[model samples]
Target: PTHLSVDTKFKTEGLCVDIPGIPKDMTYRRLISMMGFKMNYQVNGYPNMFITREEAIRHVRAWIGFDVEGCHGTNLPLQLGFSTGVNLVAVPTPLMYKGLPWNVVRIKIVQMLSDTLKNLSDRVVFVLWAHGFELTSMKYFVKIGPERTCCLCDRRATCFSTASDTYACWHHSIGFDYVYNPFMIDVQQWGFTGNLQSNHDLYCQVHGNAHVASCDAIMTRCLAVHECFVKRVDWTIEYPIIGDELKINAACRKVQHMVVKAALLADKFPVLHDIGNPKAIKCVPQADVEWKFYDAQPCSDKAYKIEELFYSYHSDKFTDGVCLFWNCNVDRYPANSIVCRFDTRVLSNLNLPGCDGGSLYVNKHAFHTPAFDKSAFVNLKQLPFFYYSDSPCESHGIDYVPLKSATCITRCNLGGAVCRHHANEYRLYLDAYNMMISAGFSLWVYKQFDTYNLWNTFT
Candidate 1:
């Protein structure tokens, strides 16, 4: 149950801590580097801090948003930020300059963070945007549970919980981390695809000031209340982070084009495609436009008739019913395969294979909850595939009333699939897509290509 919201009882203000020790060998510049503080090079001055107070109030509604900015090259945290509306707190690194080792300073910061958290009620949920790094900091720094050893040899046991204790040979111990995932809220998972500068009710004021640790935290709280409470958004299904090998590919371009076209069609009328029953056509409100059925040749041996039809949105300059994957080989692939893409606006660094290119495949049979399960398709790692499920466009919170279509990845229910698929998939993929953008990918735009532009403009 990885869901939580800010209650009215949630704290609006918090105090800050000042650490006493700074490493002796560390210089001011070196300390800044080690703390991983990023500056606005465009702004003139020595060690100009990037954040201020007034602009912090302009982001969102409620819930405490927590953020930490640590070393870019080193592994130490320099600052911690928390915010509830405009009431923001920023904890600066201890500056007493004690002649202690740098590692000791890091440890002390962790201790301070733990003590700070311990003061809060267990019911208090920490809200963060993309929670992994902060969780990483908390894990290795904060200690949780008891230390145990193999009773015979007295070696420290590597275990996560007492539940893992085997009576005779080994004793149980928790890892050197705080388990905060269940107790934390990830605003990124709320399926809101907009940027931080959007107008919302909580917006107080705005200046050129942005990207400060406290300001980002304040913005996250603002974002959470708008998406989760005001509009009430659905949870985006989680997907694997995957490795570098799966990160980039030419196939991704093809899939993006396919998904963009699919999105256009899905919005008009829901077209459900079931790998289990490819020949069947299920349309909602009955499609006025007829589907153009066709035969696709994968290999030279034979041509299989594919009921998986996707209509590309083209201008009068392009022919009617242009099959994006006309040369696709159906035999080598499984029956339950999907051709999809992410919007270049949402996903950055894409090559932007437009409405005219080929599309990639995802094994529809491979889709399921707890995405990393044994039933997961292994080869999916190689393709630019994403989790696709059609869900209702409604806000689901802790008191969430489960919707049947939300979790059904197997087959389409009474409602035809593509419409909700387009909506929810766009939302969920935006989350994964944003993560990639943060990793320094480029945002692809369809207008870059003259060929795509010509047809898109006329259409």
Candidate 2:
């Protein structure tokens, strides 16, 4: 008969008892109590359960995909794969239950496996729980989990609008339709002069329909032509001289000399120019000049003494008498001149907004530059059109156009130079034909701004 000897120790009240060939840590009392229990016991009955220290360690190593040779003290049991446990320590099922009362189910599985194993009682149970239910086995569950779906949309789409749960389709809804039309024909055969009455007369003669409706159509076309022409001309001409005034006083000659000298010194030897002397040149007498001394005078003197010096220096400065400072008063001064006629009419028309019974009169003389042959005829043709189209109407469209003119009216004078500068005049002209369509008023006029570069480049 073979005698099975227990080779573990037990402890109670600080007293240790050991059986033959048993480890000191394993208690004899615990082993005796376990052996006394009435339970079926077998070695390696649960093939899936890990039993014995060596077998359990081998299972953990294979599951984690790595050896735990030198990592035993690091406290990290699951060193690699999804299921690995090496640092974990296990107690006997009965002992673990006695130590932790709340985890009775975990202890039961450990105890069951430990009793069935012949030489392995130190193996630990991989305890798992789902919804408060304990899972005794690992082979029953294994698979990759699914991610959560978006709450707003079924297909993981992002919702954009605050008023609805629908996702926004940004690629299909954000552009405008740009239109391009070219159906218009230039009707020069009718000889439309941009005058409402003239246009209506021409339309009646050609179309044989002199009714108010026909007049309206003709006037509309005429106004369109006028607008086209006005738009073609840019409106930023610069005024040569118009705003500030200049006064030359004979009494201020001394001050002027000092100012000139200082300006000259500022340009040459700027440093030493600031030095002063008690006997600095104050004034020079005309007799002191050998007539040649006058030649030594500053070149700017020619600008101040224009008329008297013209015979001597004018030819050299501007051979054709077209000095930058020459006076062109007769050619560009009157507000009623040809170039300024449109501006004057525009201003006048604007002053009287509601006067629409009879014909309105515009003085061509109010412009600064008298109209040339072609311009005069154009103005004459435009006058009647403006008058007839500006009558009472309904839904009057945008018909106001600004007109500007250049006049010679320098704001300053250095003497005999006659500052003939460019000045802009303004006016308003009515379109009588538009008024007859409905019980409303439709007047078209213009405003002005000087555009010198525009005049030189295009006109």
Candidate 3:
């Protein structure tokens, strides 16, 4: 009774000095302004807080703040409100049923808000104080439609609102045409230049109606305007993600690693398996060597001249004209496959299939160099493949691993006195390894060579 009497005295006489913590110099009008209470503002049953839509568009980008109020536990939505700085509009599905539970009214309330939002302009930005509650409440709008998120079978389609009237997903389905291109802002999460009171405190101080959607939206717009334009704070807009958009992006990132790992294993196998074990290289004179050409019927030994033996483009590099021969198990490789030798010391590098300008096996010919050993022929049976040296620098063009200056013979240090030659055969094997992986062969054996530094870490 005393508190009511004090309030009545203040209203009638405009006296605020009797109130606790009231300054003697404070007047009734100033005290009301400090609490943000508008006086005599209502005209024709509509408050001055609501503005016309045309007046709302005057704000840059036409910022629109939205909010929803619901029941405590289930969050059964009661009302949804939108504010465009000066304009405030609220949706309260006002109707009472004699015997119906309030739960039955929730969906209809959500549907009404959905219909209200469907008519708004897409050029406007939608804001919330905190995203989660508003986001949860907005989900109900989408639930009124069919179970299918979209009717278009294309996986690339993102949620978008349209005005074609007839929805895309199904003939009778209720689609969220307002969510397609959302420029959303969570004012609490986003930064502002000025320090402001907490959301609850701000709402309590200036709110015109308690627990009402129109008042909630009005406070959001008030804060957004004060912090955004008044303080000149840079506000960031968020593109609200709906459904599987976040999941698909993360899955695509994981698949990229799978592709890269396969490519690395494929391109580094030859040098990767090289043990650098020294074996005595054997050479036979051109006259003593048997030359067999690919797919050509032998026209007797005298049919083709020795000049026609495209045997070695680098035949002049060797002092005595000799063809190096590396024996391949006849059972493992086709016996008719020909091998040709080209000395890498003189000839330029060739990345071709037939001849890489080195003493390597091509077709049926065993073009011999000091690089091949007995173990090489054993690896031939492991996979139906051929190997060659293509790059002189011993680099495999993979940037992920560190490069070394050591060569195949130098790193192995098999013999005390080995020549410092850069004719590394690892480059050739790495190329072949890459090709095999590309062709769907899962031959990942680079670990052996990676430890020895013949090929760097490719795994």
Candidate 4:
């Protein structure tokens, strides 16, 4: 479990890297722009970040708790977040639909890196992360057996599965300049979205009743296409000779190494130990056999143990099951160091309409330790990085009187200083509204009594 006292905001911000495109001092506008299909969740830079951190921690707790047990939120089931909301990890498809070039994707990716860098001392670094694991649907298969069975190659053959999975043809996927969607093969070539004329209706037939749309739900076809696209967070952060990149990178490495040291010193929190050395610190793509951990058989077993231990992941976040840090180990990384590094100098930018890159990246678990050079570094091009959160708030109940529910957080608090604290929920939630009648009890006198216990007051 994460320490109630530890702050990932601080831990995460110390991690940094040198990348291209985004400006150093990013504005609220650029952050919103980086949000893409998730732009709606954007908030101005004040209280929003404050409250976001609060709730995000809970998200972290619930996910981690669920990993050990089944610790999801009360109202929110582990539907893995839906596509309709702040699915920061979802592909920036609208950009693709608009017919933009791949460079657009890179610049946006850069802007996102800029926003996530807040170090957490002065209060203004609110962040929402999302995750999309490598997803391949079990619904479609080539049926490779003793004989050379035919593959599921036609448009009509890959229908929507009731299982509600968005998938890709991993059996034969994409290259930088080639089309990989078996959905509309004849209609596809390279990064192109394929013939809208015929393919538009094809998704309908392909998905059938399984297709659900809403910011709450994702369209089956949209999910399918994205599943096949490459996962992105694998690129490298060039080691810069100077500036914040160097400073933060050093800080990150220091902290990361310390955490490992701390774990070994503790001799108990084994989860916090480094997963591997420089080369093995990052995540290896999940295999199909491993994916079964989340299947009906496994989930149904009362004695079934786990691997899908995610404290953070997002809408359209697709990894079926994972095995990694838990409890204090929640602070650990996927494969490489929790504070990881990558080098994608080799792979030329691959294309997906509206997206491409060699040095591309995205919002991932906040890297507390710095990313560094490793023998495992690759010049390989990849796609979607995983995501965990994307969005906000509750102060103590009684103390939150004057402010009518924390509106957006940045608004300056206009109410007078609070006098007392909210009563604990373990006992009572008295609906006793305070009545102001300009009576005999003067403010100077009554206020002093409650002031010592001073309640919280956020606008």
How many steric clashes between backbone atoms does each model show?
Answer: 9, 56, 16, 33
Per-residue lDDT tens digits of candidate 1, residues 303-412? Answer: 23232323333122212322222223332222223322122123221211111111111111111111012122222212232333333544333122323434222123
> What is candidate 3's CA lDDT for residue 81?
60
When 2 and 3 are scored with lDDT, the better candidate is: 3
Candidate 3's displacement at residue 293, Å, is 97
Global lDDT of each candidate = 0.32, 0.21, 0.31, 0.21
Please state every model's RMSD to the true fold in angstroms. 21.8, 43.8, 29.5, 27.8
Q: Encode model 2's per-residue lDDT on 357-387: one tens digit a residue.
A: 1111111111121112222222112211211
Write the residue-wise lDDT of candidate 4 on 1-459 in tens digits: 321121212211111221233344533334323322122442322211112222332222111000000112122122222221211222212111222232332233223222221121111111211111101110111111111111333211111122322221222111111111111011111123433223333422322222111121222223222222222221232211212333333443333333333222222221222222233332222211221111111110011121343334421232222222211112123332222233223211111111111111111221111111232213211111111110112234333334233211121222322222321211111111011101000011111122112113221
- Is 1 or 2 the stronger prediction by TM-score? 1
TM agreement with the true structure for every prediction: 0.24, 0.11, 0.24, 0.19
Q: What is the lDDT of residue 69 in candidate 4?
A: 8
Off by over 4 Å in 2: 1-52, 61-459
- Clash number for candidate 4: 33
For model 4, the run of ten residues with the poorest summed lDDT: 61-70
Alpha-carbon shift of residue 102 in model 1 (angstroms): 8.4
What lDDT does model 1 reach?
0.32
